[PDB]
Design a protein around this ligand. Structure first.
Ligand SMILES: NC(=O)[C@@H](N)Cc1ccccc1
Ligand SMILES: [Ba+2]
Ligand SMILES: [Ba+2]
Ligand SMILES: [Ba+2]
Ligand SMILES: [Ba+2]
Length: 362
């Protein structure tokens, strides 16, 4: 179609800007998932990006942890409004923290991401990360306002594990990956994934990388204007906040099933996607969030899904509720600064795609 051609052109233009590679999966109503790629999986080997290359999805993981949690709500063992003192009795302010605040970025919890060394081989524990957060972050009052929280999701993961008696990867695999045939999806803290299949991730030595969000010391020198950051950070360090590995294809599988109502009942899905308040994420198109899903605005279209930033892999997934379209776009270029083109600019091709879809429907 002319749509195919416009979309490939969008991805082509984006890599021509200096993005190493990009992988897209897009499903439209009444149609199969279409896959598109441009540029390279591996910059130095000049290996072409395919629909089978795996990426670290970063915070897109949170949508799966939220889903996992809401599933345990359905099982009747968890209440979205009950205090987390049940699982975390000695956690400061826990009595003011209902289960839901862990998912909605309004808990005031101290965060760990900006203090955590991104270059490391340390195997982290969920509790280590929690203790590390309280050591290095600033805690605010629950319900102070929205401030993006990775710690809330780590604690969510710990609930999943206590309520099921196994690592949270087991719950996500049996209740989500298996039933939907997501065969190319892994949970990084608790599962070994095949590195040889992963697209390489690239941090760019860019001029607009002024205020890096990460401790990226120990990097060494850039080759051809980039670092290969694929294996800088062990995924256990992100844990339930960003440890998943997947393909745009598998992500769209998840997204179709979620919005179709084939995972969560009507009430848990409404909670995830419709029970919303305003939300900010620096550099991004985020305007609101629910309990596991961000609302990201692209002119006259909006996606409900998530963004993900983990060194070298930059992702946007979501569902446009008006058009029915589900998408996951991951590039293997990034930087440290939220406002860098290599981070924030992942939104440009996304915006262009939603407007091309719109055109072909007008
Ligand atoms: N926006 C993101 O995708 C990152 N917060 C994911 C992440 C969590 C924890 C550590 C590193 C990375
Ligand atoms: Ba500086
Ligand atoms: Ba390492
Ligand atoms: Ba509109
Ligand atoms: Ba037209």
């Amino acid at each position: 179609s002319d749509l195919n051609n416009a979309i490939q052109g969008i991805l082509d233009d984006h890599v021509a800007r200096g993005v190493v590679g990009v992988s897209l999966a897009l499903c439209l109503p009444g149609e199969e998932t279409s896959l598109y790629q441009s540029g390279y999986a591996d910059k130095f080997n000049k290996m072409p990006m395919t629909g089978d290359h795996l990426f670290r999805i970063a915070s897109c993981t949170k949508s799966f942890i939220a889903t996992g949690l809401h599933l345990l709500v359905q099982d009747g063992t968890v209440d979205l409004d009950e205090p987390i003192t049940r699982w975390f009795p000695d956690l400061p302010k826990a009595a003011q923290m209902p289960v839901r605040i862990l998912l909605n970025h309004r808990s005031g919890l101290p965060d760990f991401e900006t203090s955590m060394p991104m270059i490391s081989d340390k195997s982290w524990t969920a509790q280590e990360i929690v203790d590390f957060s309280f050591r290095h972050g600033v805690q605010k009052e629950p319900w102070h306002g929205m401030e993006y929280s990775n710690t809330g999701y780590v604690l969510a993961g710990m609930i999943i594990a206590h309520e099921t008696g196994k690592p949270y990867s087991d719950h996500l695999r049996s209740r989500i990956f298996a039933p939907l045939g997501m065969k190319d999806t892994w949970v990084g803290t608790h599962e070994t994934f095949p590195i040889e299949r992963e697209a390489r991730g690239y941090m760019h030595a860019a001029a607009d990388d002024e205020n890096p969000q990460w401790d990226v010391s120990g990097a060494g020198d850039p080759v051809d204007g980039v670092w290969d950051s694929t294996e800088w950070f062990p995924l256990s360090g992100a844990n339930a906040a960003g440890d998943m590995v997947s393909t745009p294809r598998d992500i769209v599988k998840f997204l179709n099933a979620l919005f179709d109502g084939r995972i969560l009942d009507q009430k848990r899905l409404w909670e995830m996607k419709d029970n919303i308040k305003p939300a900010f994420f620096p550099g991004s198109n985020t305007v609101a969030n629910g309990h596991g899903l961000l609302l990201m605005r692209y002119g006259s279209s909006e996606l409900k899904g998530h963004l993900g930033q983990i060194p070298g892999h930059t992702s946007i997934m979501g569902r446009d509720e008006e058009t029915g379209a589900a998408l996951m776009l991951i590039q293997n270029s990034g930087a440290g600064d939220f406002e860098s083109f290599y981070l924030k600019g992942v939104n440009e091709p996304v915006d262009r795609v939603l407007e091309a879809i719109k055109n072909s429907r007008s």
